[PDB]
Amino acid sequence: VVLAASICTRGGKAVLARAFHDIKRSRVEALLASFPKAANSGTQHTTVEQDNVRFVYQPLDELYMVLITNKQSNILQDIDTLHLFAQVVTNTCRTLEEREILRNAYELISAFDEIINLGYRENLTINQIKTFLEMESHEERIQEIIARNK
Amino acid sequence: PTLQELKTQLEKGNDETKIETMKRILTIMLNGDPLHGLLMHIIRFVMPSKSKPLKKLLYFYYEICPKLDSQGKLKQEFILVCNGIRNDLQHPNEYIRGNTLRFLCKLREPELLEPLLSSVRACLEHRHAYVRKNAVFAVASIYQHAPSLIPDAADLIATFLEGESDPTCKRNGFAALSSISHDKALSYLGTVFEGIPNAEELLQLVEIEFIRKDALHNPQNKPRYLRLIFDLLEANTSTVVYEAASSLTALTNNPVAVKAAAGKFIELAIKEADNNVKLIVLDRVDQLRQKNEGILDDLIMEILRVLSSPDIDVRRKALEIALEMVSSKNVEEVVLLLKKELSKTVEQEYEKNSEYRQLLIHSIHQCAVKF
């Protein structure tokens, strides 16, 4: 499962961090701090194991998009999640500069929460995610009209 | 200090401006300083707002603000917060309910959860799958962190599960049930066991997850699990096939099973476009090979099929694994393939293939030395 997601610097500093499951954010920030030494080696280009976790990650311009997972997590699925997260970030921020990500931070976290709840993922398209975030509800619109009715 | 300025922003703001204030408040807090005198301002000028975007910032603040005073007792303001949450748990907007339910999965203070329980329980029977999928996780979460609040949670979820039609709610339901009640998840699994091969991917994944758990607690079900797992080697998604092959080796040292899982891994290395995935499953093949010397030698020509990936790292890994399986029985068949690859690097993409071509010449030279 995906314990947490982070966009972070190549030096191990979180630009944003979102814990989904069984992990405090402070613990996330500590894992990321030790992350760059595992990643900068040509060990693998996508995954490194450190502590009792695995980092699934890709470059995001000069940043890193990073999922933290337990070591038994389905890695094929987690690479697909990572791509989906990366696609969200690019579609949401005008640029992939740190400052611009920071501008869209809380929007980015709300989107991440549409994808992962408690570590598990939904097979959502970017369109469904955009739709969820819009929060347009027929019931809500219909209830206020039933309201003004009475 | 800066608190005052914030406080003034909440007092005089509108929805649009308060959204920017709440964003500053959040950033300030996460980065270090908790703004203590703010709670009551947020309750007064943010919570009664109707702006959905602002409401999400509110719950983000609820996640991080301190709940307890100096004497380890819940702050009084959160009585007012609970009326707010209980209203959001009853909102016409399905999304608000879903977002509020996600939040409750993070709440730990029983004194906050207790006045919300009836509303949460009601959400299990909402018409909208967006609400149901979040409520069943909420219920399992309350029970994990505060069992006395809902001692019948395992029964609730079981019931939720028996009538559920939404695949995402079915997946969440089974995950939630098994996280709090092995036995009742087991019974549920038994009723659906014959249809697992045509279950949806997500549910298939957690069903496999659970089967590994029960194979250890109840080893008498392990053969029926093994047969089912073999069948899942032919699943339609690559995630499930990967999950079935990882589990099958985890349950038995049997060479038939090992070779079978190996072959599925090799099929993935061939089928999947992502070269990092190719490298990952190749290392699964490699490790099986180390722990079972001999068992996979029949798959050597399938390994070599991976060489039709244009990536030099994929090509290098495939050749290493293959060379560690070259025996007298197959060396000539292997060298003929290598040469045929070598010939193709002269005709196709001569420049890009320079590194690969040298690697082929080297591997062919290896085969000569080994014999």
Residue numbers in the entry:
A (entry chain B): 2 to 151
B (entry chain A): 20 to 390
Structure paper excerpt:
Crystal structures were available for the majority of the components of the COPI coat, but not for the βδ-COP subcomplex. As a first step towards a complete structural model, we expressed and crystallized a complex containing β-COP19-391 and δ-COP1-175 from C. thermophilum (Ct), from which we obtained a molecular model of βδ-COP comprising residues 20–390 of β-COP (‘trunk region’) and residues 2–150 of δ-COP. The overall architecture of βδ-COP is similar to that of the homologous γζ-COP. β-COP(20-390) is a curved HEAT-repeat type α-solenoid consisting of 20 consecutive α-helices. The right-handed super-helical arch of β-COP wraps around the δ-subunit. The structural model of δ-COP comprises a longin domain followed by a β-turn (117-122), and two helices a (127-135) and b (139-150), which are part of the linker region connecting the longin domain and the μ-Homology Domain (MHD). The stretch of residues between helix a and amphipathic helix b traverses the β-COP α-solenoid in the vicinity of helix 7. Helix b, including isoleucine residues 143, 146 and 147, projects away from the α-solenoid where it would be accessible for binding partners. Helix a and the first part of helix b are present in our x-ray structure. While no electron density was visible for residues 151–175 of δ-COP in the x-ray structure, our cryoEM map of the COPI coat has clear density corresponding to a longer helix, and we modeled residues 139–165 of the predicted helix b into our density. The sequence identity between the βδ-COP from Chaetomium thermophilum used for crystallography and Mus musculus used for subtomogram averaging is 53%.
Coat protein 1 (COPI) coated vesicles function in retrograde trafficking between the Golgi apparatus and the Endoplasmic Reticulum (ER), and between the Golgi cisternae in both retrograde and anterograde directions. Coatomer (the COPI complex) is a heteroheptameric protein complex, consisting of α, β, β’, γ, δ, ε and ζ subunits. Arf1-GTP recruits the protein complex coatomer from the cytoplasm and anchors it at the membrane. Polymerization of coatomer at the membrane assembles the COPI coat, which recruits cargo molecules and membrane machinery to the assembly site.
